[PDB]
Amino acid sequence: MPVIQTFVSTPLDHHKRLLLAIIYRIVTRVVLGKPEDLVMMTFHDSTPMHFFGSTDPVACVRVEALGGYGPSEPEKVTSIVTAAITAVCGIVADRIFVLYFSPLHCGWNGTNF
């Protein structure tokens, strides 16, 4: 049960958010090896951010999956997500952070996994 938070300084509409949504689904199924219906995605557009001494368009993606990650999976996920934000939001690669975390416990449908 992975969770993907997307923080962007640029405004996001229905088209952009839907695009990133399907992307994260494919990444979850193909790379993470998890069901694409079980991944939760949140989008935080128009977020006041500051990076590299400027308030220029910048993105920060948070990936959290229980049980950790595979050997070559984080490298793959980072590449795809960065490329996804680059094409969709127009944010350059050198202004995109992708952080990976692992929760101690995760709950769904009133029960833990």
Partner 1 sequence: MESVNTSFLSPSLVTIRDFDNGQFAVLRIGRTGFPADKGDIDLCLDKMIGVRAAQIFLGDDTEDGFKGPHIRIRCVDIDDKHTYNAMVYVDLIVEVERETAEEEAKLALRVALQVDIADEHSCVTQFEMKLREELLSSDSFHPDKDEYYKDFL
Q: At what angle do helices 73-88 and 14-26 cross, to 10 degrees?
A: 160
Q: Which residues contact 98 (CB under 8 A, 6 or more apart)?
A: 60, 61, 63, 77, 78, 81, 82
CB of 84 to partner 1, least distance (A): 6
* Rounded CA separation 109/113 (Å): 10
Pairing of strands 3-8, 59-64: antiparallel
- Which one of 86, 92, 100, 106 is in contact with partner 1 (CB under 8 A)? 86
Distance between CA atoms of 73 and 80, rounded to whole angstroms? 11
Which tokens is 66 given?
């229980």
Site for partner 1 in 4-63 (CB under 8 A): 15, 18-19, 22-23, 25-27, 29-30, 36, 53-54
State the minimum distance, in angstroms, from the CB of residue 92 to a copy of itself.
9
Residue span 1-40 as binding mask against a copy of itself, x where in contact by CB under 8 A, dash where not: x-x---x----x----xx--x---x----------xxxxx
Could you list the residues that contact a copy of itself (CB under 8 A)? Answer: 1, 3, 7, 12, 17-18, 21, 25, 36-45, 47-53, 58, 60-61, 64, 68-69, 74-75, 77-79, 81-83, 93-94, 96-112
